[PDB]
Amino acid sequence: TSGQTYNKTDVYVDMKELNKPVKYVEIIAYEQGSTSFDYVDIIESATFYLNSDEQFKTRAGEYFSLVQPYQHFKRSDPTSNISTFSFALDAGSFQPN
Amino acid sequence: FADPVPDTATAFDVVLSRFTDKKAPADLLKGATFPEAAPYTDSEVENISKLALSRVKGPDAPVLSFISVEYAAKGVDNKKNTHYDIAFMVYDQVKNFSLKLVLVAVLDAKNKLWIKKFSSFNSFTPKDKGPKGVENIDETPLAEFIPDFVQFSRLYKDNA
Amino acid sequence: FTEVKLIINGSDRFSGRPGAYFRLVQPYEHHVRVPSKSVYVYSFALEDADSRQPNGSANFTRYDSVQLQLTLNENLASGRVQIYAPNFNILRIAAGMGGLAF
Amino acid sequence: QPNGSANFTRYDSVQLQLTLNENLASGRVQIYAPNFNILRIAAGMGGLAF
Amino acid sequence: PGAISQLVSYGAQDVYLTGNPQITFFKAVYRRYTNFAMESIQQTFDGTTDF
Amino acid sequence: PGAISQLVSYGAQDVYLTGNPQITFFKAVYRRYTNFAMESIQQTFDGTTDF
Amino acid sequence: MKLYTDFVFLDAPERIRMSEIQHEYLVTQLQWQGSEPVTAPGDPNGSTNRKI
Amino acid sequence: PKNLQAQNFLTATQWIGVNTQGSSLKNANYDLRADPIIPKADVGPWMM
Amino acid sequence: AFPTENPYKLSGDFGNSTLEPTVTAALRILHESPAPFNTEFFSRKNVDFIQKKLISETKRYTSFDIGPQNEDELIMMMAGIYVQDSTFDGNIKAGLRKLNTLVITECLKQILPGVRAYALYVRDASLPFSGGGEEAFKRPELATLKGSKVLSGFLPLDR
Helix/strand/coil (H/E/C) assignment for every residue in chain G: CCEEEEEEEECHHHHHHHHHCCEEEEEEECCEECCCCCCCCCCCCCCCEEEC
Residue environment code for B127-150, b if the CB has 16+ CB neighbours within 10 A, otherwise e = eebebebbeebeeeeeeeeebbeb
CA distance E41 to E26: 42
What distance in Å separates the CA atoms of residue B20 and residue B8, rounded to the nearest whole number? Answer: 17
Please report, for residues A75, A96, D13, D14, D49, the alpha-carbon distance to residue D7 in angstroms, rounded to integers and kept in the order given: 37, 39, 12, 11, 15
* Length of chain F measured in residues: 51
Whole-angstrom distance, CA of residue B5 vs CA of residue A82: 59
DSSP state of D8: G
Please state at what angle helix I71-84 crosses helix I22-30, rounded to 10 degrees. 40
Which residues have CB under 8 Å from E7's CB, separation 6+? none
φ and ψ of E39, to 5 deg: -135, 135
Cβ atoms D5, D36 nearer than 8 A? yes
Rounded to whole angstroms, the Cα distance separating B144 from E22 reads: 6
Tell me if C34 sits within 8 A of C25, measured CB to CB: no
Which residues are B36's β-sheet partners? B76
Those of residues 116-155 in I touching chain F at CB distance below 8 A are 141, 143-144
Indicate which technique resolved this structure: cryo-EM
User: Do residue F21 and residue B131 have CB atoms under 8 angstroms apart?
Assistant: yes
Sign, CA dihedral F1-F4-F8-F10, equals positive
Q: Name the strand (E) or helix (H) holding B11.
A: helix B11-18
- Give yes or no for a contact between B48 and B112, defined as CB atoms under 8 angstroms apart: no
Q: What DSSP state is assigned to residue A68?
A: G
Measured distance between the N- and C-terminal CA atoms of chain A, rounded to whole angstroms: 46
Q: Give me the long-range contacts of C21-30 (CB less than 8 A, separation at least 24).
A: none
Measured in whole angstroms, the distance separating CA B127 from the mean position of its chain's CA atoms is 14
Chains I and G are touching, with contact defined as 3 or more CB–CB pairs separated by less than 8 Å: no
Give CA–CA dist I66/I58, Å, rounded.
Answer: 8
Cβ separation of B138 and A92 shorter than 8 Å?
yes
Q: Mind telling me how many Å the CA of D1 is from chain F's nearest CA?
A: 6
Alpha carbons E34 and F19: distance in angstroms, whole number = 8
Chain E 1-20, residues with CB within 8 Å of chain A CB atoms: none
- Say which DSSP state F2 is in: H
Sign of CA dihedral F41, F46, F50, F51: negative
Rounded Cα–Cα distance for residues B20 and B6 (Å):
13
Chain F residues touching I141 at Cβ < 8 A: 12
Q: What span, in angstroms and rounded, lies between the C-alpha atoms of B7 and G22?
A: 18
Please tell me the distance from the alpha carbon of residue F26 to that of residue E36, in angstroms, as a whole number.
10
- The secondary element (H helix, E strand) that includes residue A11 is none
Dist CA E34 CA A37 (whole Å) = 39
| DSSP per-residue codes, I69-95 | --HHHHHHHHHHHHHH----SS-HHHH
Declared resolution, Å? 3.8
Q: Which of residues 17-36 of E touch A (CB under 8 A)?
A: 28, 30-31, 33
Question: Burial, I38: exposed, middle or buried (Cβ in 10 Å; 0-12, 13-18, 19+)?
Answer: buried
Residue H16: phi and psi, rounded to 5, are: -100, 120
* Structural Rg of chain C based on CA atoms: 17
CA distances from G22 to B14, D41, F24, I49 (A): 17, 6, 16, 63
